[PDB]
Design a protein around this ligand. Structure first.
Ligand SMILES: CC(C)C[C@H](N)C(=O)O
Ligand code: NA
Lengths: 99, 274
């Protein structure tokens, strides 16, 4: 009855140090709709994160985009942390500029 | 090409106090244009695309009336469903509804849809002829009989074949600068080594609209699916979409492999090679 989220973590635009960009965490395929999604900078929760309006796919599973403005640098590590009723432990997906 | 207008509705019961959480969104093609959220302070249907802001206060009054009516129907339904399935008052449950219309390239009616799920599973749907229903179990069959007695299909068919298409045509005209514009994918290829025997080639498609796209790999001109990975199409957040496809190849044999990209914005498919 319960379907676990798929997670992709990526930038809005091509990733270049020093330029204002946007960090996205796209969560999809999940049911029920209650979900916790955090964006992390060097392991710490980013405060000003927005998300899209809840919608769903043909199979009734839900999808959301979570996003925040960020200026990438060489040292800063970013990730998405997701909790859902299907997960025993929060799941962390690192941002990899190549995916 | 073809176009669509679709509305999506989600209600989630809240056992111990008050009415369900209700969220409604409307799309033209892959562009969201309205929302309603029961938790928001406005208690209005709200614009989410610049081209719907044109519409006058009478539009916003009528859409707000209609969407609040849908929220009440879902409230009652969550009650009916809990009773039919003999469920307790303790758990939260979900109803979802989607409806709308497809038109072809001539903007004439192609297909209409109206369907309904409980706890994420099919419950009842209008068939393609818009004259009959698909009920998944005996609870839904009781709903079907009810809706047959009240000629519900007839009312929905009139909306889906007529009114729905009329609104879609209006929006496509009003929003033409974006809704009728195709943004072809911006493509490139990356290369990474795992070991010195194995390499990964990744074909990227960025900044495209609408979301439909096909990415395929060939080896020496023949389709290859083994040793490939295709990610789900994802929103960029600026209204465009992104996708990639990768293949693992023997190091030194990268020239054998081509990626092929098909999209409505490309007059002929694109071929990329490392
Ligand atoms: C509130 C909206 C989903 C109503 C839709 N415009 C209709 O007339 O059905
Ligand atoms: Na509307």
């Amino acid at each position: 009855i319960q379907r676990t989220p798929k997670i992709q973590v990526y930038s809005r635009h091509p990733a270049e140090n020093g330029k204002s960009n946007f960090l996205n965490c796209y969560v999809s395929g999940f049911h029920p709709s209650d979900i916790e999604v955090d964006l992390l900078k060097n392991g710490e929760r980013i405060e000003k994160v927005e998300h899209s309006d809840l919608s769903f796919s043909k199979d009734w599973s839900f999808y959301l985009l979570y996003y925040t403005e960020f200026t990438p640098t060489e040292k800063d590590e970013y990730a998405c942390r997701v909790n859902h009723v299907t997960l025993s432990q929060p799941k962390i997906v690192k941002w990899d500029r190549d995916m | 090409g073809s176009h669509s207008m679709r509305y999506f509705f989600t209600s989630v019961s809240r056992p111990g106090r008050g009415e369900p959480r209700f969220i409604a969104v409307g799309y033209v093609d892959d562009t969201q244009f309205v929302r309603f959220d029961s938790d928001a302070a406005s208690q209005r249907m709200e614009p989410r695309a610049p081209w719907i802001e044109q519409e006058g206060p009478e539009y916003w009054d009528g859409e707000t009336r209609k969407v609040k009516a849908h929220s009440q129907t879902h409230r009652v339904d969550l009650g009916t469903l809990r009773g039919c399935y003999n469920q307790s008052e303790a758990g939260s449950h979900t109803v979802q509804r989607m409806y709308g219309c497809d038109v072809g390239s001539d903007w004439r009616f192609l297909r209409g849809y109206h369907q309904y799920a409980y706890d994420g599973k099919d419950y009842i749907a209008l068939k393609e002829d818009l004259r009959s229903w698909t009920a998944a179990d005996m609870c839904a069959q009781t709903t079907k009989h009810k809706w047959e007695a009240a000629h519900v299909a007839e009312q929905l068919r009139a909306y889906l074949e007529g009114t729905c298409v009329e609104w879609l045509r209006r929006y496509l005209e009003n929003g033409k600068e974006t809704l009728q514009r195709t943004d072809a994918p911006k493509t490139h290829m990356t290369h990474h080594a795992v070991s010195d025997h194995e390499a990964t080639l990744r074909c990227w498609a960025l900044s495209f609209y609408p979301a439909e796209i096909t990415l395929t790999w060939q080896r020496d001109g023949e389709d290859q699916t083994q040793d490939t990975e295709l990610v789900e199409t994802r929103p960029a957040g600026d209204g465009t979409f992104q996708k990639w496809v990768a293949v693992v190849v023997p190091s030194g044999q990268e020239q054998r492999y081509t990626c092929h990209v098909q999209h409505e914005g490309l007059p002929k498919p694109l071929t990329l090679r490392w």
